[PDB]
Amino acid sequence: ETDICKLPKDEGTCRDFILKWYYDPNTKSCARFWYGGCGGNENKFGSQKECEKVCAPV
């Protein structure tokens, strides 16, 4: 959708690890990643369902 969905996965830094989801434009679907708590970007969602609503083509 918006160009935020095309941003790269960014695991960031810091050690407050939380599992997040990001949209992968190459597979047209969201996948999980571990975010460290600092230095990420906006292609980062708390659930697969939210990532898919905001980002996926259908």
Swiss-Prot record:
Q: Which family does it belong to?
A: Belongs to the type VI collagen family.
Superkingdom of source: Eukaryota
Q: Tell me where it resides.
A: Secreted, Extracellular space, Extracellular matrix
Q: What is this protein called?
A: Collagen alpha-3(VI) chain
Query: What does the record say about PTM?
Result: Prolines at the third position of the tripeptide repeating unit (G-X-Y) are hydroxylated in some or all of the chains. The N-terminus is blocked.
- Complexes and interactors: Trimers composed of three different chains: alpha-1(VI), alpha-2(VI), and alpha-3(VI) or alpha-5(VI) or alpha-6(VI).
In this chain the BPTI/Kunitz inhibitor domain maps to: 5-55
Query: What disorder does this protein's entry note?
Result: Bethlem myopathy 1C: A form of Bethlem myopathy, a slowly progressive muscular dystrophy characterized by joint contractures, most frequently affecting the elbows and ankles, and muscle weakness and wasting involving the proximal and extensor muscles more than the distal and flexor ones. The clinical onset more often occurs in childhood or adulthood, but it can be prenatal with decreased fetal movements or neonatal with hypotonia. The hallmark of Bethlem myopathy is long finger flexion contractures. BTHLM1C inheritance is autosomal dominant. Ullrich congenital muscular dystrophy 1C: A form of Ullrich congenital muscular dystrophy, a disease characterized by generalized muscle weakness and striking hypermobility of distal joints in conjunction with variable contractures of more proximal joints and normal intelligence. Additional findings may include kyphoscoliosis, protruded calcanei, and follicular hyperkeratosis (rough skin). More severely affected patients manifest at birth and never achieve independent ambulation, while patients with milder phenotypes might maintain ambulation into adulthood.
* Site, Reactive bond: residue positions: R15, D16
- SS bond list: C5-C55, C14-C38, C30-C51
Known function: Collagen VI acts as a cell-binding protein.
* Span of the entire protein shown here: 3108 to 3165 of 3177
